[PDB]
Design an enzyme around this catalytic site. Structure first.
Site, PDB file in Angstrom:
ATOM      1  CB  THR A  74       0.673  -4.202   6.874  1.00 43.32           C
ATOM      2  OG1 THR A  74       0.489  -2.833   6.505  1.00 43.32           O
ATOM      3  CG2 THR A  74       1.623  -4.877   5.894  1.00 43.32           C
ATOM      4  CE  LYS A  82       0.098  -1.603  10.494  1.00 39.78           C
ATOM      5  NZ  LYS A  82      -0.047  -0.207  10.000  1.00 39.78           N
ATOM      6  CG  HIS A  91       5.422  -3.467  -2.333  1.00 38.65           C
ATOM      7  ND1 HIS A  91       5.405  -3.883  -1.020  1.00 38.65           N
ATOM      8  CD2 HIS A  91       6.721  -3.247  -2.644  1.00 38.65           C
ATOM      9  CE1 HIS A  91       6.642  -3.918  -0.559  1.00 38.65           C
ATOM     10  NE2 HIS A  91       7.459  -3.534  -1.523  1.00 38.65           N
ATOM     11  NE  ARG A 114      -3.304   7.968   1.471  1.00 35.19           N
ATOM     12  CZ  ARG A 114      -2.279   8.583   0.885  1.00 35.19           C
ATOM     13  NH1 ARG A 114      -1.054   8.501   1.396  1.00 35.19           N
ATOM     14  NH2 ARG A 114      -2.483   9.291  -0.217  1.00 35.19           N
TER      15      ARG A 114
HETATM   16  O1  RUG Z   1       3.511   1.457  -5.174  1.00 36.01           O
HETATM   17  C1  RUG Z   1       2.632   0.340  -5.021  1.00 36.01           C
HETATM   18  C2  RUG Z   1       2.199   0.218  -3.561  1.00 36.01           C
HETATM   19  C3  RUG Z   1       1.795  -0.881  -2.945  1.00 36.01           C
HETATM   20  N1  RUG Z   1       1.515  -0.489  -1.701  1.00 36.01           N
HETATM   21  C4  RUG Z   1       1.043  -1.315  -0.574  1.00 36.01           C
HETATM   22  O2  RUG Z   1       2.197  -2.060  -0.091  1.00 36.01           O
HETATM   23  C5  RUG Z   1       1.899  -2.722   1.157  1.00 36.01           C
HETATM   24  C6  RUG Z   1       3.195  -3.299   1.724  1.00 36.01           C
HETATM   25  O3  RUG Z   1       3.623  -4.398   0.915  1.00 36.01           O
HETATM   26  C7  RUG Z   1       0.831  -3.801   0.897  1.00 36.01           C
HETATM   27  O4  RUG Z   1       0.459  -4.406   2.123  1.00 36.01           O
HETATM   28  C8  RUG Z   1      -0.420  -3.197   0.254  1.00 36.01           C
HETATM   29  O5  RUG Z   1      -1.301  -4.255  -0.119  1.00 36.01           O
HETATM   30  C9  RUG Z   1      -0.024  -2.357  -0.976  1.00 36.01           C
HETATM   31  O6  RUG Z   1      -1.165  -1.722  -1.561  1.00 36.01           O
HETATM   32  N2  RUG Z   1       1.746   0.720  -1.578  1.00 36.01           N
HETATM   33  N3  RUG Z   1       2.146   1.192  -2.652  1.00 36.01           N
END
Ligand code: RUG
Length: 810
Positions: free
Chosen positions: A650, A654, A351, A543
């Site tokens: 995401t 939305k 991610h 965030r």
């Molecule tokens: O731990 C790494 C992480 C990645 N993310 C977020 O994941 C989301 C779901 O895939 C992504 O849309 C987003 O770009 C990412 O920062 N949140 N935490």
């Protein structure tokens, strides 16, 4: 009232009303003279919950009989939000409950507002898990979400003197009607201890035992009578725990702290022991549960045919060595066979590419906490590196780069490397991200095993993110093309034939205006802030992070303010600039950015010359329930991360689904969104990934931009001199210093293009008809970004299971 909200038949309304009164009396132990709105909410929640259980029991019975391949989605986060409306939507009860409550003299929307968010996630990753559960149920997959039941979810954000204050999110204080405790299925989880080698193999002994107690929450599919389970583990001490007497009982908290609190970090790794315990706790309890269910169908050859384990990021990466531990140490399988089973069972979703977000656990922590797992990881590494050495003989640099064990002052385990080695599939979350993985951080692994690497572009559930939060838009769409799009979002393409339809243009624009009025009213009622609902609603909610570049937004806001102050009597398109999002409590720069936003608001919102032409609002306590309110109200979606940093996003999806235009960089899923809608219908600006790389190569010099852009100079000089903080002139010194000298995300480099692009936005907004037509082109091409599409791709290409829209008996 409206069609998509279902039937309000006399039989159902009467039956709901009596069960509501039954629950109020028998369940809540209240009469209508003492009952408060909260009591009414719980009575409704219990009434709606009753409708789930029949379907829940028969779904799980159906899986026991048909014995399909089961999907286990392992995640440390499930950002569920509120459950009441979602449940009504998915069971077609919304209008009936609306009618039933109205006849009882109650406003259902008022009752809905009482429900606490299930805030068991930080942002996009946790919310993705939640959307995924919804889609898996909607697609009739035998899927289980497994996580931790945190006692405290993501903190509630209070803004005090412009600063973020955190308070405990005590989401369980009034109880959770949705969960069912299952203390009968409590499982032991082991920590610490030591490894003993015998004639019959390794034994993990002298361990500390923590109990894992499951709580099951129903996950209803969209009108298909499927109800899947999200099982969340709670930490409990054994009864002989530390068993002077009083202290031993009080020290039970030590064990139970495991499930106490969600780590409030978004896209940032904090290498704390408690976090590692959480990660193993979920994994160990889940795997026992998986194996138990599998055996209740000895022969582990069929394990991968009956089980898929999806690792949501590396957080549950210990599933790999834990599965190996169980198969080798407990089931007595040979290593090679256990490994084959493990690889075919596990798949890993990445991610992020941000280095500070990648999990690298100190060996010394794993050595103490999970000594057997470290031994297994070492063995995995050796065998994996033997394969690398055989494939690329003499390439010693590659060996070092690909090792699961990182060398240095402190030895670390790279959990991403562990995951790639032990999974048959590795996917990124947007096409550009998956390509970046193969070209950069996982290049060596891609060269070794190209077949493992896939893309699965993220999605959002159109149930929560259209039908639930934007009924007005759902309805005007349904009037034209029917209701089938709700579970087949690609059908929104049919709306392209209405782009020149004057009635539809008016309706689309009417729905937006209504949403904006409702949200403008929400702001006054709940936060006492005055906004102009005729202004462009310019929103960035996500965030707070440097890579997401709320600071670039801030620079534009100050630019608009300065331009107004320079030519006060010139017309500018009125804007309400809304920025919201939480900062991780330890993230100083993010906390400073929040302060800056409010500081800008304090100056801009009180300047008489500005009037109502520019307003800067910091949206406090951004969370799923707030997203459901602000997103339908938005005109402009700010998706302005530095190219190559936002894996997907995401929130972007939305906003697109809800009739906002997007200003954004070619980053994450923005690329695919622009591709779907047409670049003409997107406000794309700034460096592409390749431009960022070129800038990195020659060296990013922020001073250059400062020197050559007078408008940018002015802002920086305003920040430095204390224009936005008169009582503390140096308040934003850290921000200015970072911008000028150590900005990893090249805020200045995109500034000119951003401001220019924003001018194009304002120009289009001046022509309401053409704005709306572009909006229609966006909504109409947002179908790809349904999580139903995403999950169907996981099912077919990773899990080896076929989705189904076929309904189970009611
Ligand atoms: O731990 C790494 C992480 C990645 N993310 C977020 O994941 C989301 C779901 O895939 C992504 O849309 C987003 O770009 C990412 O920062 N949140 N935490």
């Amino acid at each position: 009232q409206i069609s998509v909200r279902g039937l309000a038949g006399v039989e159902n309304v009467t039956e709901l009303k009596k069960n509501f009164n039954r629950h109020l009396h028998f369940t809540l132990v209240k009469d209508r003279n003492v009952a408060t709105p909260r009591d009414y909410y719980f009575a409704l929640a219990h009434t709606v919950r009753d409708h789930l259980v029949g379907r829940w029991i028969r779904t799980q019975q159906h899986y026991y009989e048909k014995d399909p391949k089961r999907i286990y989605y392992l995640s440390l986060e499930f950002y569920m939000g509120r459950t009441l409306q979602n449940t009504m939507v998915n069971l077609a009860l919304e209008n009936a409950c609306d009618e039933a409550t109205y006849q009882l003299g109650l406003d259902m929307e008022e009752l809905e507002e009482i429900e606490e968010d299930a805030g068991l996630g930080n942002g996009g990753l946790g919310r993705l898990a939640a959307c995924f559960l919804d889609s898996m149920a909607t697609l009739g997959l035998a899927a289980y979400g497994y996580g931790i039941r945190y006692e405290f979810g993501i903190f509630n954000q209070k803004i005090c003197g412009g600063w973020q204050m955190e308070e405990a999110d005590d989401w369980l204080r009034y109880g959770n009607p949705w969960e069912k405790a299952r203390p009968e299925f409590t499982l032991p989880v082991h920590f610490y201890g030591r490894v003993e080698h015998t004639s019959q193999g390794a034994k993990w002994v002298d361990t500390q035992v923590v109990l894992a107690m499951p709580y099951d929450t129903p996950v209803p599919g969209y009108r298909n009578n499927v109800v899947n389970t999200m099982r969340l583990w709670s930490a409990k001490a054994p009864n002989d725990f530390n068993l002077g007497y009083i202290q031993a009982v009080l020290d039970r908290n030590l064990a139970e702290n495991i499930s106490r609190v969600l780590y409030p970090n978004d896209n940032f790794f904090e290498g704390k022991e408690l976090r590692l315990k959480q990660e193993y706790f979920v994994v160990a309890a889940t795997l026992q549960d998986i194996i138990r269910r599998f055996k209740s169908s000895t022969n582990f050859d069929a394990f991968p045919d009956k089980v898929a384990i999806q690792l949501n990021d590396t957080h549950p990466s210990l599933a790999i060595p834990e599965l190996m531990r169980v198969l080798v140490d407990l089931e007595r399988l040979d290593w090679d066979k256990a490994w084959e089973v493990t690889v075919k069972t596990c798949a890993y979703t990445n991610h992020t590419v941000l280095p500070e977000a990648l999990e690298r656990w100190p060996v010394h922590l794993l050595e103490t906490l999970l000594p057997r797992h470290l031994q297994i990881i070492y063995e995995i590494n050796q065998r994996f590196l033997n394969r690398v050495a055989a494939a690329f003989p003499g390439d010693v640099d590659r060996l070092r780069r690909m090792s699961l064990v990182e060398e240095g002052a402190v030895k670390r385990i790279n959990m991403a490397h562990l995951c790639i080695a032990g999974s048959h599939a590795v996917n990124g979350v947007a096409r550009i991200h998956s390509e970046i993985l193969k070209k950069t951080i996982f290049k060596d692994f891609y060269e070794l095993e190209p077949h493992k690497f896939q893309n699965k572009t993220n999605g959002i559930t159109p149930r929560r993110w259209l039908v639930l939060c934007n009924p007005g838009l759902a309805e005007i769409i349904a009037e034209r093309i029917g209701e089938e799009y709700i579970s087949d979002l690609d059908q929104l393409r049919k709306l392209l034939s209405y782009v020149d339809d004057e009635a539809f243009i008016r309706d689309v624009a009417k729905v937006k205006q209504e949403n904006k009025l409702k949200f403008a009213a929400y702001l006054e009622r709940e936060y006492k802030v005055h906004i102009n609902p005729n202004s462009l609603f310019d929103v960035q909610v996500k965030r707070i992070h440097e890579y997401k570049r709320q600071l670039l937004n801030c620079l534009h806001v100050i630019t608009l303010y300065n331009r107004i102050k320079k030519e006060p009597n010139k017309f500018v398109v009125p804007r309400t600039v809304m920025i919201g999002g939480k900062a991780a409590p330890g993230y100083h720069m993010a906390k400073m950015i929040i302060k800056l936003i409010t500081a800008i608001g304090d100056v801009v919102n009180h300047d008489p010359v500005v009037g109502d032409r520019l307003r800067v609002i910091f949206l406090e306590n951004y969370r799923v329930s707030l997203a459901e309110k602000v997103i339908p109200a938005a005109d402009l979606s700010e998706q302005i991360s530095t190219a190559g940093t936002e894996a997907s996003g995401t929130g972007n999806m939305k906003f697109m689904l809800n009739g906002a235009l997007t200003i954004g960089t070619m980053d994450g899923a923005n690329v695919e969104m622009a591709e779907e809608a047409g670049e003409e219908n997107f406000f794309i600006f700034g460096m592409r990934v390749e431009d960022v790389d070129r800038l990195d190569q020659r060296g990013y010099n922020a001073q250059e931009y400062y020197d050559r852009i007078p408008e940018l100079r002015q802002i920086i000089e305003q920040l430095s001199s204390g224009f936005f903080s008169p009582k503390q002139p140096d308040l934003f010194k850290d921000i200015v210093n970072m911008l000028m000298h150590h900005d990893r995300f090249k805020v200045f480099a995109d500034y000119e293009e951003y401001v220019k692009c924003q001018e194009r936005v304002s120009a289009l907004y001046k022509n309401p008809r053409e704005w709306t037509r572009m909006v229609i082109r966006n909504i109409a091409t947002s179908g790809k970004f349904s999580s139903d599409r995403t999950i169907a791709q996981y099912a077919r290409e990773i899990w080896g299971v076929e989705p189904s829209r076929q309904r189970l008996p009611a």
